Design a protein around this ligand. Structure first.
Ligand SMILES: O=c1ncn(Cc2ccc(F)cc2F)c2ccc(Oc3ncccc3C(F)(F)F)cc12
Ligand SMILES: [Mg+2]
Ligand SMILES: [Mg+2]
Length: 559
């Protein structure tokens, strides 16, 4: 079927949209080529629509069916619990889109009579009505990027707040536990960045002669078929479920997940969707399971040897045993043809890689540096262009989610996060006297409230003390960072070092947690190094819940 059908009505904005970076007096300090930074708007919606609208092709075979049964067998061991309305409401982000039925996120979190009553009625409706397609809103996503030698806006589709809370009640436990049960070590969201690196390095070293490749599916969401979504449900149905949860999943599958009507911000009928909606609770879990199923089966059809998958939603990386240069190239092409028959055609053509550092997955790659002792330390990094472009935007405008904070946390050991992000933002927080103000950021799609002053402990717990002492980064990494700085007009190393020394001195003079930040985060800026010992508060931190499952588009808030 067609991934989408359009009536002609436009994808409209719900308010004024900004596309250019403001001439802010603080962003210029970070990067001077502000005209290279832009934010996607609804003005590019039609370009996106054209790209994601097509008739899907899907041919399933014995390998696909064999893998599916293997997956259902593992899912059969799971017992999922139904969440109470109270628990589901608590998972709702403070600024989640308000309901059109007279209440908003704040009311939901406070369990106001009107919110709870409506949510109960929506739930009862899911139990009684197994067919009525649920209405959804389609909007052009606003994301920041750097121009390339421009990307049209992504299309986000989501149902009303009332329905979102019901999804949580019926499926939050399922999407948080089932992927792990079914895919085991191949489920990427169970790993912190350091653990992902560990799994990738260990997997790579377990092969006699490793070969790996990332596989980019062309607009994954639009390639997901009605069949794929019902297969996904068949996996969920293998769980032991409360009667009402079983019905809710059945109803949500047919009324929401497989497709439904699209309405714009103005309330006009925009069209119909017959593929994956980006804004529902099962999107991350569903995409992960679907990608894993197709890829695992494709590997068998392609005769790839000893394939180890690492899947994060629609993001896939495969590491296997090489059968020789020519053989690998042929097997990869066969893999691609199999994925294409499964309705997972390639975007960027895949290529075999024989160097782990050259494989980019989840927009990142493994690289190596050295700790104070001179020992090699593996860590996760990525091209800093997008992170810096977004950091500039967030410096110029107030944004609900602070990607710069998430990036400092996830990429703390990198040369760029330490030299630029830490220096830039701690300088600003100092100047505005906002060091202790908690900020929201996202980790694997879930929203978290984090105190900047707690970064030292967080970083030590997630990355280890070496994160504060890494040096001698790889030639490849240095070149990439350097090129990015030239491209964006970011000040050179010397400028950041001078700014860091100044920021460090100020933080130290404040004592308390601020001084700890100065000591650990900026030890790289001084010659007279400080002996960095284990931070007491680090051993008392439980960040376990931070890396359990993916929730992008799931409207999830973890307090
Ligand atoms: O390997 C390193 N080993 C140590 N330092 C010191 C250092 C500075 C900031 C930081 F947070 C961590 C550090 F350990 C470096 C500082 C800069 C650098 O990279 C460059 N070197 C020369 C020119 C340009 C660059 C780059 F644009 F920054 F990549 C590489 C290294
Ligand atoms: Mg974990
Ligand atoms: Mg893709």
């Amino acid at each position: 079927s067609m991934s989408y059908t359009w009536t002609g009505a436009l994808i409209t904005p719900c308010a004024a949209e900004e596309s250019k970076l403001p001439i802010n007096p603080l962003s210029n300090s970070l990067l001077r080529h502000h005209n290279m930074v832009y934010a996607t708007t609804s003005r590019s919606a039609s370009l996106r629509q054209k790209k994601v609208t097509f008739d899907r092709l899907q041919v399933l075979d014995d390998h696909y069916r064999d893998v599916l049964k293997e997956m259902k067998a593992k899912a059969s061991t799971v017992k999922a619990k139904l969440l109470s309305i109270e628990e589901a409401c608590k998972l709702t982000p403070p600024h989640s889109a308000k309901s059109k039925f007279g209440y908003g996120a704040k009311d939901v979190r406070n369990l106001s009579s009107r919110a709870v009553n409506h949510i109960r009625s929506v739930w009862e409706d899911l139990l009684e009505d197994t067919e009525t397609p649920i209405d959804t809103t389609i909007m052009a996503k606003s994301e920041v990027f750097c121009v390339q030698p421009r990307k049209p806006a992504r299309l986000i589709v989501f149902p009303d707040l009332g329905v979102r809370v019901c999804e949580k009640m019926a499926l939050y436990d399922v999407v948080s536990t089932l992927p792990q049960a079914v895919m085991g070590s191949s489920y990427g969201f169970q790993y912190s960045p350091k653990q992902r690196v560990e799994f990738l390095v260990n997997t790579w070293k377990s092969k006699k002669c490793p070969m790996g490749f990332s596989y980019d599916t062309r607009c994954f969401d639009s390639t997901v078929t009605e069949s794929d979504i019902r297969v996904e449900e068949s996996i969920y149905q293998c769980c032991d479920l409360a009667p009402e949860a079983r019905q809710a999943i059945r109803s949500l599958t047919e009324r929401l997940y497989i497709g439904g009507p699209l309405t714009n911000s103005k309330g006009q009928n925009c069209g119909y969707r017959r593929c994956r909606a980006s804004g529902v609770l099962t999107t991350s879990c569903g995409n992960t399971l679907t990608c894993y199923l197709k890829a695992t089966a494709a590997c068998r059809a392609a005769k790839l040897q000893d394939c180890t998958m690492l899947v994060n939603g629609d993001d896939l990386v495969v590491i296997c045993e090489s059968a020789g240069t020519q053989e690998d190239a042929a097997a990869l092409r066969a893999f691609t043809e199999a994925m294409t028959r499964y309705s997972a055609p390639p975007g960027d053509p895949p290529q075999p890689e024989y160097d782990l550092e050259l494989i980019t997955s989840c927009s990142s790659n493994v690289s190596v540096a050295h700790d104070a002792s001179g020992k090699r330390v593996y860590y996760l990094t990525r091209d800093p262009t997008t992170p810096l472009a977004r950091a500039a935007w967030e410096t110029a405008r107030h944004t609900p989610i602070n990607s710069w904070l998430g990036n400092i946390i996830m990429y703390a050991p990198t040369l760029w996060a330490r030299m630029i992000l830490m220096t830039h933002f701690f300088s600003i927080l100092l100047a505005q006297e906002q060091l202790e103000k908690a900020l929201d950021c996202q980790i694997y799609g879930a929203c978290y409230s984090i105190e900047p002053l707690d970064l030292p402990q967080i970083i030590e717990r997630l990355h280890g003390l070496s994160a504060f002492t890494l040096h001698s980064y790889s030639p490849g990494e240095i070149n990439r960072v350097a090129s990015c700085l030239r491209k964006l007009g970011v000040p050179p190393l010397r400028t950041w070092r001078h700014r860091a020394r100044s920021v460090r001195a100020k933080l130290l003079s404040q004592g308390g947690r601020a001084a700890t930040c100065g000591r650990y985060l900026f030890n790289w800026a001084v010659r007279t190094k400080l002996k960095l010992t284990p931070i007491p508060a680090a051993s008392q931190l439980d960040l376990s819940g931070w890396f359990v499952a993916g929730y992008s588009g799931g409207d999830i808030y973890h307090s």
